[PDB]
Amino acid sequence: MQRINALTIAGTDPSGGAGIQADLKTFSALGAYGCSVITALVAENTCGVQSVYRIEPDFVAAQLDSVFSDVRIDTTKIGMLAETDIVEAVAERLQRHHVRNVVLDTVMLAKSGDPLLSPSAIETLRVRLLPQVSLITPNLPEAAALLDAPHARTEQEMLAQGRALLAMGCEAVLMKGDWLFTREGEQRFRVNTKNTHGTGCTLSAALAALRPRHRSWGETVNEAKAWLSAALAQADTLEVGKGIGPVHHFHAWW
Amino acid sequence: MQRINALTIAGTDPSGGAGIQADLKTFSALGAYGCSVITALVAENTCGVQSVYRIEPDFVAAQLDSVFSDVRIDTTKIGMLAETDIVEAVAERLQRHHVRNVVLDTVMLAKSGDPLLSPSAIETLRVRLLPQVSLITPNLPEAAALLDAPHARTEQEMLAQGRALLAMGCEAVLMKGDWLFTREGEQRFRVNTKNTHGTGCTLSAALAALRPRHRSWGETVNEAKAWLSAALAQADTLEVGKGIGPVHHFHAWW
Ligand SMILES: Cc1ncc(CO)c(N)n1
Numbered sequence: 001m002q003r004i005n006a007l008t009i010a011g012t013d014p015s016g017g018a019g020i021q022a023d024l025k026t027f028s029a030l031g032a033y034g035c036s037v038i039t040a041l042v043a044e045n046t047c048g049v050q051s052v053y054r055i056e057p058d059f060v061a062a063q064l065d066s067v068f069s070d071v072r073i074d075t076t077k078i079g080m081l082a083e084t085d086i087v088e089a090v091a092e093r094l095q096r097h098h099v100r101n102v103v104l105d106t107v108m109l110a111k112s113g114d115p116l117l118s119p120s121a122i123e124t125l126r127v128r129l130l131p132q133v134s135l136i137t138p139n140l141p142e143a144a145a146l147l148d149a150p151h152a153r154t155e156q157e158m159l160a161q162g163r164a165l166l167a168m169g170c171e172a173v174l175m176k177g178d179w180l181f182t183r184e185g186e187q188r189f190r191v192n193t194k195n196t197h198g199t200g201c202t203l204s205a206a207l208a209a210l211r212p213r214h215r216s217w218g219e220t221v222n223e224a225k226a227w228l229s230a231a232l233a234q235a236d237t238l239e240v241g242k243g244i245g246p247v248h249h250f251h252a253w254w
Numbered sequence: 255m256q257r258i259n260a261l262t263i264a265g266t267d268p269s270g271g272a273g274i275q276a277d278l279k280t281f282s283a284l285g286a287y288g289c290s291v292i293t294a295l296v297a298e299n300t301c302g303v304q305s306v307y308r309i310e311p312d313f314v315a316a317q318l319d320s321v322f323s324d325v326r327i328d329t330t331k332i333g334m335l336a337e338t339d340i341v342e343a344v345a346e347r348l349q350r351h352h353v354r355n356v357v358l359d360t361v362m363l364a365k366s367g368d369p370l371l372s373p374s375a376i377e378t379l380r381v382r383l384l385p386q387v388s389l390i391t392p393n394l395p396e397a398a399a400l401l402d403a404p405h406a407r408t409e410q411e412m413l414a415q416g417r418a419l420l421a422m423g424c425e426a427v428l429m430k431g432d433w434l435f436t437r438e439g440e441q442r443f444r445v446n447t448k449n450t451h452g453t454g455c456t457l458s459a460a461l462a463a464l465r466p467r468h469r470s471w472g473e474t475v476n477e478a479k480a481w482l483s484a485a486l487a488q489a490d491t492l493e494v495g496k497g498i499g500p501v502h503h504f505h506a507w508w
């Protein structure tokens with residue numbers, strides 16, 4: 001298979017279940033050389049977040065450039081963005097290097113629970129970043145927050161929000177309940193475990209790493225979910241942490 | 255195979271060839287769930303280091319605790335330590351949690367070239383950390399710097415330094431030219447590529463991930479080298495960077 005390099009722009013998880021740790025693992029498992037730009041450090045854990053350590057937007061920018069000025073990036077996954085300046089720096093580099101296949105997960109809350117959404121950040125995100133993502137993967141609350149609209153009550157409202165997100169620049173949207181939105185139309189798409197830490201990061205990283213090997217987003221959405229389901233299906237064979245464990249990114253190898 | 259969790263305490267490489275990126279990849283490739291504590295961020299590249307970003311020793315400490323207070327660690331690899339306070343914080347946690355199978359690579363220089371050795375750090379390292387490592391993997395210049403002795407001229411001197419490092423606390427020493435030193439005795443151990451970025455990190459991470467599946471350090475040193483050789487043997491099939499590329503951590507899977 002052709003060599004594809006994948007890049008992740010996100011936060012860190014020392015326990016290795018979420019963040020760039022999960023993104024990098026997922027890329028590896030799905031056949032892609034992995035690159036990563038850190039936007040924030042966090043003493044995280046299988047039992048929640050202990051603390052967050054901020055990084056200077058300038059260094060994030062420095063990291064982006066160290067990568068884009070040297071390695072050809074075929075797919076990109078974006079996780080935790082933290083603040084307005086990071087969002088801006090990221091969008092700017094994405095625009096300068098004509099980066100495509102950008103998958104944007106919506107990390108605007110928190111595992112332990114907490115709306116990590118800087119009101120100034122969200123506005124910058126919808127105006128400066130959205131117009132550059134190939135696929136956005138929000139759940140209902142997140143979709144609502146991005147649109148600054150009420151939490152979808154019915155299926156119709158949920159479909160309206162997907163279409164609204166497209167008009168804002170996104171090439172595609174995967175509303176997680178799962179519905180995939182494209183200019184063409186919509187498409188509809190079993191967890192038996194409690195160890196689901198990092199699922200979101202993993203799904204988005206997977207969608208990113210898989211995109212270059214498929215015809216359409218639908219095709220890639222289909223394979224990534226199948227794969228993620230297999231990862232969850234083995235989550236319990238892992239012995240990490242006392243709280244909620246991660247999925248088994250390498251179920252297919254060991 | 256029994257589940258083994260591996261932990262890396264080191265710096266970052268955004269291009270994914272060295273640092274915790276390489277460590278985490280290597281763990282993954284060799285069947286171990288990976289954990290990582292970041293000691294320093296660096297806008298690095300296949301063409302060298304652009305800049306280094308310091309992290310508060312306290313956060314390093316916070317990271318160690320987030321991990322050791324939740325995940326059972328079976329093997330540990332230590333890379334970039336940066337400064338005295340980090341070395342101290344690391345040694346302290348290693349001591350508190352009776353951490354074993356500690357593999358310490360000697361990152362006291364720089365890819366682009368530069369002795370990243372804080373004279374205060376090196377002294378703290380030999381007094382506080384060395385007594386807790388299972389295996390140290392220095393090359394000649396590094397070995398000399400740790401011993402504060404002249405660069406070994408002959409084989410005898412090289413053997414003297416290995417034995418001296420044992421007396422300082424190290425359970426084993428792998429002097430890279432390669433000689434493995436143990437209480438028992440010594441043991442002696444082809445690169446056709448130019449893309450060797452991250453080799454050192456990869457070897458140490460491999461030795462760490464492999465240790466728990468072998469009888470002795472000799473046995474594990476043997477397998478890790480064979481594996482690393484295969485990784486180098488495919489380094490050229492990768493398309494990352496313009497300078498010196500990384501090895502192919504996943505030669506065995508894709
Ligand atoms: C750094 C980071 N990014 C994303 C998530 C998802 O909850 C997390 N827990 N941590």
Ligand SMILES: Cc1ncc(CO)c(N)n1
Nearest residue numbers: 265266272273334364365
């Ligand atoms: C973070 C990091 N650790 C170790 C090395 C090896 O010189 C490197 N280039 N980068």
